[PDB]
Design a protein around this ligand. Structure first.
Ligand SMILES: Nc1nc2c(ncn2[C@H]2C[C@H](O)[C@@H](COP(=O)(O)OP(=O)(O)OP(=O)(O)O)O2)c(=O)[nH]1
Ligand SMILES: [Ca+2]
Ligand SMILES: [Ca+2]
Ligand code: NA
Length: 325
DNA sequence: CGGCATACG
DNA sequence: CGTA
DNA sequence: GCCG
């Protein structure tokens, strides 16, 4: 088992679901306390289990696995012997964990804002609604739409949405294309938001495109909230006899950068962090969603495909469905 | 021990 | 600060 | 919290 998640296939469904979910609770709780290092270790340990070919049934099976030290091993040991880990359950039922989770899941609220509100004594969404003076426009939209945004978007919703985006994109710039990215590209059947990547086959034609796309979607009455090359929006999605609010991310990239943007925006988040860490620490190359830079030659790699990028980095290619780290 | 992804709005 |  |  290699140490970086980008070095091994990770399928969406696997053989250690309960163990990985418990470790991910501890990772999330570490994030709420500002401990990014502990968050990473717990996420990496959970991801190792997702990549295993069969269930862990005995503690011995963790020997040699990366990211399993005393703490993550004890969590697994308690789950194997008792079906529950006391530390995990204590986190789950803690006021701090529950409130930080509730607040950070609001669009416009991160860990830092959630933590400040927590320290001020705030605990519920109604607490926030009573003091709207405290809220940015973005947070007001996130709070008003919170219920709909807490409902998963179904893969079965996505195609009709892609068609409306494609119509606005085609008016904004004929020949421009729309690619579904994010978790849905990795095979997920649900998500918290839909992610689209827009480009045009003629380099440079995409300049200034996103404002034109947004204006057209707004004029069609589809945008409940927005506000360049990235837009984090709230869209109106049709439902039987009504509609629901959905989060949609739109990104524009020049075609020269499209494979890098496709790779970055397809995730998973941990996969991309691990891939960029591998690139820098093992290969000496700097990776982002625009390119891959050799800081010794001061040159950018050209890529025409995601396959090119994996080859550049000396890694076996993984299709999106195996990037569910 | 240092390091932990890397960007845009 | 927020967002991916 | 863990790796190197
Ligand atoms: N506000 C909010 N954020 C969420 C929720 N579920 C997951 N997240 C966070 C976890 C990650 O930091 C981030 C992942 O979103 P992305 O669109 O970048 O990733 P991906 O498409 O894999 O995830 P998704 O399936 O849409 O949840 O969103 C949720 O219900 N609400
Ligand atoms: Ca997203
Ligand atoms: Ca998504
Ligand atoms: Na949030």
């Amino acid at each position: 088992m290699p140490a970086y998640a980008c070095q091994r296939p990770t399928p969406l469904t696997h053989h250690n679901t309960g163990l990985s979910e418990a470790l991910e609770i501890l990772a999330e709780a570490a994030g709420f306390e500002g401990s990014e290092g502990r968050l990473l270790t717990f996420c990496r340990a959970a991801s190792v289990l997702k990549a295993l070919p069969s269930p862990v049934t005995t503690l011995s099976q963790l020997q040699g696995l990366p990211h399993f030290g005393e703490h993550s091993s004890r969590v697994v040991q308690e789950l194997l012997e008792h079906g529950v880990c006391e530390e995990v359950e204590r986190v789950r039922r803690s006021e701090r964990y529950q409130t930080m989770k509730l607040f950070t899941q609001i669009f416009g609220v991160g860990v830092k804002t959630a933590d400040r509100w927590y320290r001020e004594g705030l605990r519920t969404l109604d607490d926030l609604r009573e003091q709207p003076q405290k809220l940015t426009q973005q947070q007001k939209a996130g709070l008003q739409h919170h219920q709909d945004l807490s409902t998963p978007v179904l893969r079965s919703d996505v195609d009709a949405l892609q068609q409306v985006v494609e119509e606005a994109v085609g008016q904004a710039l004929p020949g421009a294309t729309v690619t579904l990215t994010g978790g849905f590209r990795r095979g997920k059947l649900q998500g918290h938001d839909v992610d689209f990547l827009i480009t045009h086959p003629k380099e440079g034609q995409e300049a200034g495109l996103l404002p034109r796309v947004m204006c057209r979607l707004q004029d069609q009455g589809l945008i409940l909230y927005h506000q360049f090359e990235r837009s984090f929006c709230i869209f109106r999605l049709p439902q039987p006899g009504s509609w629901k609010a959905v989060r949609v991310d739109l990104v524009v990239a020049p075609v020269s950068q499209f494979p890098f943007a496709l790779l970055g925006w397809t995730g998973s988040k941990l996969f991309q962090r691990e891939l960029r860490r591998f690139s820098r620490k093992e290969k000496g190359l700097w990776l982002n969603s625009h390119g891959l830079f050799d800081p010794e030659q001061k040159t950018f790699f050209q890529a025409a495909s995601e396959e090119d990028i994996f080859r550049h980095l000396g890694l076996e290619y993984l299709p999106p469905e195996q990037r569910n780290a």
